[PDB]
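ARCHIVE CARD
Drawer: 12
Card no.: 0347
Subject: one protein chain, sequence and derived structure
Cross-reference: see card 0346
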Amino acid sequence: IMTDAFQTAESREVTGAQGFAPTEGESIVLSHNIQHQVALPPDLDYEYIPLSEHKPPAEPARTYSFKLDPFQALSVASIEREESVLVSAHTSAGKTVVAEYAIAQCLKKNQRVIYTSPIKALSNQKYRDFQAEFGDVGLMTGDVTINPTASCLVMTTEILRSMLYRGSEIMREVAWVVFDEIHYMRDKIRGVVWEETIILLPDKVRYVFLSATIPNAFQFAEWIAKIHRQACHVVYTDFRPTPLQNYFFPAGGKGILLIVDEKGNFKENNFNQAMAMIEKADIAKIIKMILKKNFQPVIVFNFSKRECEQMALASSSMKFNAPDEENMVNKVFENALASLSEDDKNLPQISNILPLLRKGIGVHHSGLLPILKETIEILFQEGLIKVLFATETFSIGLNMPARTVVFTQVTKWDGQQRRPLTSSEYIQMAGRAGRRGLDDRGIVIMMVDDKLEPETARAIVVGNQDKLNSAFHLGYNMVLNLLRIEAISPEYMLERCFFQFQNAASVPQLERELISLQQERDAIIIPDESIVKDYYGVRQQLEEYNKDMVFVIQHPQNCLGFFQEGRLIHIKSPSGVDYGWGVLIKHIQRQTPKNGQPPYPEQESYVLDVLLKVSGDFNPKTRGEGPMPEGIMPAGKDSKNARWEVVPCLLNCLRALGQLRVFLPKRLESADEKDGVGKAVDEISRRFPDGIPILDPMENMGINDDSFKKLLRKIEVLESRLVANPLHNSPLLVELWNQYSLKMQLGEQIKEKKKAIARAHSVAQLDELKSRKRVLRRLGFINDAEVVQMKARVACEISSTEGHELLLAELLFNRFFNELSPEICACILSCFIFDEKIETQALKEELAKPFREIQAQARIIAKVSAESKLDVNEDEYVQSLKWQLMETVLAWAQGRPFSEICKMTNVYEGSLIRLFRRLEELLRQMAEAARVMGSEELKDKFELSLSKIRRDIVSFNSLYL
């Protein structure tokens, strides 16, 4: 009895502060951890069938003084022999070196290479990155065009899409195209641009796709191998150099609980303990603890740009940085802004964020100015930011990992999607946790507002990664180009699109699964399907009329006059759980729905306070938003906690009513007092073993409805058809009640299975093209000879991701813009681009006139499309046309500073800048339409309209970083 060690929670190492550095060390991907596959082109050449042993030397002959692990070396060994590759792994795998090898190989071989990325920013980061490296690098986005004669070209994918449609000689020279982050083909607005680009590529060229881990990696290679007729290698690894640990932080609780361990194991003992601790500003609680215990840097992902700032506001109290670092924040800040006029440098958004970044707390989202995002990015990599508040947009950002990731929400909700984050959206985010050299492990902290079943939880975290599926559909600008060029048709691309390849590949395994379970719909022989059909059908239809009897009884007009305090009531959950007999205490009328969004029927319009025996360790105070709280019930020999307890119950938990009542003392709130009344409910079962006398729905409660009466008839014929059947009480019943149940439910599988196979034979894709071709006939774009008239070449050069490709093209040779000033064209054109809804001062009636008719001219095409058997809501296809920035783009075009037009409306400063650049690109495109169509007083007015708005802070480039 001295001092000692405890032998319960006791052990050696400290993992609190000093314990996040690796003592083990660096681990490398092994050779057995990688799996190479190779996809081959099909043979319609009968006369010759090639033997393809296509396999890499596993390490390239040429290193180019790159240092390559077994994974990178193998991926690059295919590029060496000039066959395409798909490289798939976590962002941790250093997939960028592979792209650097392709570039190096071309520059040595005196060929040209093209790098693409979905983001304009990432392509700008990859530019100077590569520009520094090889010096031979050019850059082409929608915004900027730098050094196009360059052997290497970093470009955005819609510039590649455009160039494959224009057909310039640039594509003749380029030997290799590298696709970075190819998983964006999933995205529903931008998905088509990707396949189009891929479908439009020359077969002679070669491809490097870079990806996160996807299951159908071979399926992508085969697709590529088919359309472009070449061998496509696949190199895959799941290896992650630094392991992960996922913790859940319950709502309002103090502490987190491990859920997936570093071996990827889901611990349910902890998970159910974590869901148990639920029954806001504790963001700050998390970061506080994360300050002392050493987790830096930490990324915090949320979703609304609006809630992102708020969480950085609540955490601003603490100070995360040393006096030496705060001054370091100061130097880097003043420096990166030097390209700004002192006007801009003092803009309302810049001054406020600087004291925040000084404390080590950052913010990253769409609304921040482009020079702020980059600067804060620059700041984070320099570790001057310990805590960063970001939206989902940030993880796609290239170079910036953390030690810790905190999920604000596990639910992503925009317009109609009420959905769990899916394992794909989880890994791109949660993968940021952990860094090769500096970290022990990745720490991922999930915050949970609401409890969710293990299915929802597990299928997010450890649930198998999502298949990469085609987003392909039809836009107008797509098919107009496809028609025009003689060598090809929109019919052609629709066949070679990834979507149809996918449907084509699924139907063999469907028929296999179908015919496999078509078996048991035969292979189960029920002794007699004849009489079992009658028992199953009667027993099950008996249930439905019984649920309906329970329903009408529950209605307040039928059952309320019997809610005398103290009356016995049988409580049975709608879920089927039967809590037994208890006493009514109070009944309160559920208060009227406020915003209207939560309505309920009359059966749920009351909450009854009723005392029941409950085994629940739940929270008895409130029903939550459920029918009653979450807790079980005692069954036999005093289950865990046999407690007589008052619980709130939605009136639909009413099963029966006892004929008479229990005396209720005024004082019921205490422990022994609650058990006092309960002991009487036991005392009434003394002489009532056959059941407590219930109040007959008709001959007591007085429900005489012709409806209710005729429903009771149907019930007791079904009780008679039950017993008149030989199997009522015969011990082959429960045996054979399993057999039909499988034969019937497999009927549901095979019914549903068949439905899957039907749609997988896709008519819908072609039916849409036809109906659009009908619009294009009547709109004048294509003469019925299926060829394209003047207006169709005009629309071709115009790219809007809305259907305004046609509308704008119409308004152009309606010569709608001809007589305007350049300054006012930017105004009306502003409506066609943006989406974000805006609360503004007003709509000036100088500018209110022209907006009205483009709504009219849109409603023309809108309903004109409807009669073409297309699906379009006529009401607001003019939705897309919005006037809130018209006054704002006017003022800017007039020469007003950026100080003013920010307060012109309620928009984000950085949202504004992205939207004017989106404008001055549409401006560029309208000009080319005029070079194609008609008078260049139209072409050059746009070019003038362009420079009217192309100015100080909007012409601002980038920090190249």
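Annotation on reverse: Residues 34-237 form a domain with the Rossmann fold fold (CATH 3.40.50.300). The two ends are 64 Å apart (CA to CA).
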